[PDB]
């Protein structure tokens, strides 16, 4: 019989592709030695051939998709004014407000990309022709409880279009083209949302890949937006979790503990 | 005569390529209208053709260079334990320690990439063949005074090699190949450093592009490293400042105020 500590250690070393059962009755050291050997070989192969990090590679793939479809690539601050949170209509007694990492007294780590993209839409509307199409990929931060679907440090893609063409049909068509490109099956379900009102949730089984919005909405006035728009946000670690059939999203995160879903802690357990 | 407010506004709208002088005696509105028209056209052209963000594009170019030369692409946490700072030998009464953005009580925004790369070197040495070559590009954070060479939110590349081949000659040769690839002239100057001891500073005129280190050093013991190593760190916004002849590094930063060095604030000044 394996202890809980031994089972947890084997789970860290097990990968989705492995045809190995921890409930097979084999001794711990036998299972551990096989898995350590497989993971070392996996890392050696990555190092010998591709050498690309899954999160970096997916960002680059996504960037090419959106650039090629006419969207401007934005890189905006990660450390943002706390005032942008309140201006998103997030009251400081709300659950989301309690998820914010504060920095100093007046700043925070962004929990979402919307504020910066709202400002870019307003500014670019003075220079660029209709429709204005932008996107951003980068780190976002939320305090979360320990779970297999959430990270405190994650990576979000968000895109937005403003002006003509800002229909639910076009929004769903962009989402469909994007997730087809990635080879990810999904469905769309309507839900309510305290920030945006009603959303379209992009679901893979019970896992939310994205929330999307058809504007205009009452919040727009606070950002100086008065045109129709559509937009969506996606978690890159969730996309990787689906693509690679990871059991826990930690396998896809910025991490010291995993490289492309392979444990970096390859010591023997005693 | 132009007021200081008017001169500052024209400086924001002026780009290095412009053959326009603010000291020419022309009225403010004439200079402002010409510059606004040039910047709008610049943004329109970016939107019509390349659509790539300078910081994103440079990260991708750098990533390809290092991956193709056998270095593993790392993406590690930006929000790190405050204990890693002390373990770098940064005492809490030192000037660098005062530059750290603290988060919660026990975390901070990373001011450097070295701690995470030290841990990756230690772990990967159990799996990968000699020499171990890794790199990371991403956000770093330091409190700074207002100046044209420093950002509080910047982007660092750091690479390291550990094992064989870890000579000053090989380090300089990698730096030279890299900066040749980018088309940036430089010189190397020795300096002292409280964290690493002696460094090699990679200079473009009076601007430090990088600091580099030939190990081993006494700090290595604290990270479980006992082999020779070489490494260097570079600021991407500084590389862009040199490449594009920006007068202030803010033009190259993650920003709401500039897109590829072009002002996003294209209103009229009254
Ligand atoms: N903590 C997190 N970890 C990983 N991905 C996240 C996290 N929070 C949000 N995302 C991703 O970002 C997308 C847009 O954010 P948002 O719609 O606000 O998330 P959410 O409604 O809080 N999702 P959930 O907490 O699973 O019910 C989500 O659909 C996820 O793909
Ligand atoms: N505040 C900053 N803004 C932009 N780039 C930075 C900043 N701090 C460091 N870098 C870059 O990161 C590289 C490695 O960091 P490090 O050697 O610690 O910088 P440094 O010695 O503090 N440079 P300096 O402050 O100009 O004397 C530097 O050579 C810069 O290219
Ligand atoms: Mg949530
Ligand atoms: Mg949602
Ligand atoms: Mg400094
Ligand atoms: Mg230095």
């Amino acid at each position: 019989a394996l202890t809980k500590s031994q089972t947890d250690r084997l789970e860290v070393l097990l990968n989705p592709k492995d045809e190995i059962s921890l409930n097979s009755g084999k001794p711990f050291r036998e299972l551990e030695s096989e898995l350590l050997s497989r993971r070392k070989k996996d890392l050696q192969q990555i190092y010998a051939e591709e050498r690309e990090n899954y999160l970096g590679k997916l960002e680059r793939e996504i960037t090419r998709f959106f650039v090629d479809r006419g969207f401007l690539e934005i890189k905006s601050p990660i450390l943002i004014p706390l005032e942008y949170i309140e201006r998103m209509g997030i009251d400081n007694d709300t659950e989301l407000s309690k998820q914010i990492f504060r920095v100093d007294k007046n700043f925070c780590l962004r929990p979402m990309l919307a504020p910066n993209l709202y400002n870019y839409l307003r500014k670019l509307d003075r220079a660029l022709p209709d429709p204005i199409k932008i996107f951003e990929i980068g780190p976002c931060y939320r305090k979360e409880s320990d779970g297999k679907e959430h990270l405190e440090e994650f990576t979000m893609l968000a895109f937005a279009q403003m002006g003509s063409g800002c229909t639910r049909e076009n929004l769903e068509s962009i989402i469909t083209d994007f997730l087809n490109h990635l080879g990810i099956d999904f469905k769309i379900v309507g839900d309510s949302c305290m920030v945006y009102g009603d959303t379209l949730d992009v679901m893979h089984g019970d896992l939310e890949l994205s929330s999307a919005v058809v504007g205009p909405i009452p919040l727009d006035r606070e950002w100086g937006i008065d045109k129709p728009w559509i937009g969506a946000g996606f978690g890159l670690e969730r996309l990787l979790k689906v693509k690679h059939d990871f059991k826990n999203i930690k396998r896809a995160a910025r991490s010291e503990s995993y490289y492309n879903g392979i444990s970096t802690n390859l010591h023997h357990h005693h």
Side-chain angles (χ1 to χ4, degrees), chain A:
Chain A
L2 300 177
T3 64
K4 171 63 167 148
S5 180
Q6 286 171 334
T7 286
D8 284 350
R9 175 53 178 164
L10 297 176
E11 292 281 2
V12 166
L13 296 174
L14 187 72
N15 270 48
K17 288 282 189 60
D18 286 334
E19 302 300 333
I20 292 89
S21 179
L22 312 187
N23 308 96
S24 58
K26 288 163 166 170
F28 173 73
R29 286 171 58 202
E30 168 173 352
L31 296 163
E32 182 199 45
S33 171
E34 173 68 25
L35 292 175
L36 287 172
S37 290
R38 291 189 179 216
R39 302 295 82 88
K40 283 181 184 214
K41 292 182 192 167
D42 288 347
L43 292 172
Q44 289 161 5
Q45 184 184 347
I46 292 168
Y47 189 53
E49 304 303 333
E50 176 147 300
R51 291 183 293 282
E52 294 183 78
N53 176 264
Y54 281 179
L55 202 43
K57 183 167 63 172
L58 180 58
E59 169 173 341
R60 293 185 289 274
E61 177 178 26
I62 300 177
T63 295
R64 185 54 160 157
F65 177 90
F66 281 95
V67 166
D68 286 348
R69 286 156 185 74
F71 294 74
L72 188 66
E73 182 196 10
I74 305 301
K75 296 289 192 196
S76 74
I78 301 162
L79 181 58
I80 61 163
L82 191 59
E83 200 260 359
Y84 285 7
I85 300 317
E86 312 153 25
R87 284 180 59 202
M88 286 299 298
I90 297 165
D91 170 275
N92 57 11
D93 294 305
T94 64
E95 52 273 30
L96 175 51
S97 184
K98 305 303 167 106
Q99 294 188 264
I100 304 292
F101 285 97
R102 301 194 65 177
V103 180
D104 301 326
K105 195 176 149 153
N106 294 328
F107 299 89
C108 64
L109 299 180
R110 66 193 180 182
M112 56 211 308
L113 299 178
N116 289 156
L117 297 182
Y118 262 133
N119 287 330
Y120 258 103
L121 290 174
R122 185 185 65 256
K123 297 180 178 201
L124 292 170
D125 201 47
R126 305 200 62 168
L128 297 186
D130 170 68
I132 292 176
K133 306 203 298 191
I134 69 180
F135 75 106
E136 179 161 9
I137 302 169
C140 287
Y141 295 84
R142 295 183 190 184
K143 295 179 176 175
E144 306 277 359
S145 45
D146 292 334
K148 60 188 69 176
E149 318 294 6
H150 290 77
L151 295 167
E152 294 196 316
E153 173 176 55
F154 66 102
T155 310
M156 194 184 301
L157 156 72
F159 63 84
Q161 181 166 323
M162 181 176 72
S164 61
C166 293
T167 63
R168 181 188 58 95
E169 293 86 353
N170 194 27
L171 179 55
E172 297 193 14
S173 87
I174 295 159
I175 289 164
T176 297
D177 289 340
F178 177 51
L179 291 176
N180 287 358
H181 183 74
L182 298 187
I184 296 175
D185 296 331
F186 71 98
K187 297 185 164 68
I188 293 178
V189 184
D191 202 350
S192 65
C193 173
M194 295 309 292
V195 172
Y196 298 106
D198 299 305
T199 62
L200 302 169
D201 289 346
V202 181
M203 305 298 300
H204 180 89
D206 281 327
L207 182 57
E208 185 187 273
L209 302 183
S210 166
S211 289
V213 182
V214 180
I217 59 179
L219 181 58
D220 299 342
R221 274 189 299 286
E222 310 306 325
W223 298 90
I225 297 303
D226 59 16
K227 291 177 173 193
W229 65 271
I230 50 170
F234 287 79
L236 271 65
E237 293 85 1
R238 290 198 178 167
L239 296 175
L240 288 171
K241 182 175 186 301
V242 170
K243 185 186 181 176
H244 295 288
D245 199 25
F246 295 143
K247 292 293 177 257
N248 190 310
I249 192 175
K250 309 311 266 187
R251 294 262 182 147
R254 276 182 186 270
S255 185
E256 302 196 281
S257 296
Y258 296 96
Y259 187 86
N260 292 6
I262 300 151
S263 182
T264 60
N265 292 118
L266 298 182
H267 59 275
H268 285 265
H269 183 269
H270 300 286

